[PDB]
User: Fold this.
Amino acid sequence: ADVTQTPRNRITKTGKRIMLECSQTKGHDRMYWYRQDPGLGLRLIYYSFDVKDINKGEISDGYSVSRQAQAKFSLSLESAIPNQTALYFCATSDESYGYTFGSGTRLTVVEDLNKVSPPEVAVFEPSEAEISHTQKATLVCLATGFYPDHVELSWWVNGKEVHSGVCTDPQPLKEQPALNDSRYSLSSRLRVSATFWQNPRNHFRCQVQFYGLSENDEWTQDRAKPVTQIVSAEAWGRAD
Amino acid sequence: AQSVTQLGSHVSVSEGALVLLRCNYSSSVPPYLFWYVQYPNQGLQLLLKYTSAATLVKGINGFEAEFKKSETSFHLTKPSAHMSDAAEYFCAVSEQDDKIIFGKGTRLHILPNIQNPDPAVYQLRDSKSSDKSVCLFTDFDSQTNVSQSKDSDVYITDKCVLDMRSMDFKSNSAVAWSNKSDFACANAFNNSIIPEDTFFPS
Assistant:
C-alpha cells in the first residue's frame, strides 16, 4: 500500500513502553515488523497473516505485537532497553513475495535523559595554501558534544541545500570512547572552486538537525533543555 | 535449513570496473531471491528478483544477476562502478512459504580513479574569532589509507570521498582535530602511512 509508520524518529528513556504503528491501504493479509542493525541486516521480530494470526520471528524477545485490523499492525517495546536502539521497518506482502516497506522508524533508547546534549557546530574556512596550490577551497563543518547519536547534517549555499562537493562522515565518533554515554562528534566537508569561495556575496551554512527531548519531558538542570532543534554555523566568501 | 549468505560487510571496487556482489543460499528447493539497495539516509529499494522465470534477471541501471542452482548462487553484477553506486546491498530469500529473510548486507565503496594525486595537509581556521583549527589531509589516491590516532586527545575521521559535480572532480579527505596545546597539523597524521610527496605548507 502506501505503507506508513509512526513515529519517524523517537528518543526514549529505558523502562518505558513504546509503541510503533504500521498502517496500509491495500489490505494485504501479510504484515511484518523487522529491525535493522549495522552488520546484521534486517531481522524479523513478528509477523501476522490476518487478524487472528501472530507468529514470532528470529528476535521476538522484548517485543509484543497486535493486529488490530486488516489495515494496522502494532509493535510494542514492552520495557525499552538500550540494545533496542535500531532502525525499525514494517512491511506488507501480497501472496507472491511483493513486499512494500514503510519508510522507517529511527528509535534511540537512552539510559539517562540528563545526558542528552545538542551539538556545538563550527565552520572552518578554506586554507589560503589550498587555494593557491589547487584553485579549490574546502570548508569543514564540525559538530561536537552531542548525545545521543541521532543527527542529520546538511549544507546550504545561498539558502538552497547542496549535495555536490559534499562528504559527511558515515558515523560520528566517540569523544570519550571508554564511556558508555560518551558524547559524539561528526565532521563534513564541502569543496567549491576557489573563485566561488572568493566571492564575498556567497554564504555557506552547515545545518545539523539534532533529535533530543520533547516539550513534555521534565528538565531539572540549569543548562538549556536539550530539545530537538537545529544548530547551524556559517561563513561568508572572502576575497583575501 | 534455509539461509542466505553475503560475505564481506564492506567491499571495494575501482571506479569504472566490474561490480560483483556475492550471494549464496541454502535451500534444497530453488527459492525466490531478491537484491535490495539502501542509499544512505533512506529505506530499501528492490533492484531485481528471481521468481522462477528468466534465469538471467535484469534490473534497474545495468544491474543483473544470474540464478545458478548448481552452485546455489545469485551474484549481483553491473558492468562499470560509478560513484553513485555507493550504498548498502542486501541479498534475500523466500522462506517457509511465508516471508523474506535478509542477508547481513554488504556496503560497496567505490575507489575514485585519481590520475593526478596531489596529497596535502592543510590547516583550516574557525570562521569565528577563536584561534581554533582543524587539519585536512586531502587529495591522496586510494593507495593511501588513514589510521586512527595513537592519542586519545586527537580525533581523526575515516577517509571520505567527495564528488564535485561542478568540475567533474573527486577527492579523498580525512579531518583531524584536538584541544591540546602541543597539536600541530604537521604531526596530526603521524600514525598514518602518507605519500612521501605530501605537501606540508608553511
About this structure: Chain B touches chain A through 55 residues (CB under 8 Å). The two ends of chain B are 64 Å apart (CA to CA). Residues 113-200 of chain B form one domain.
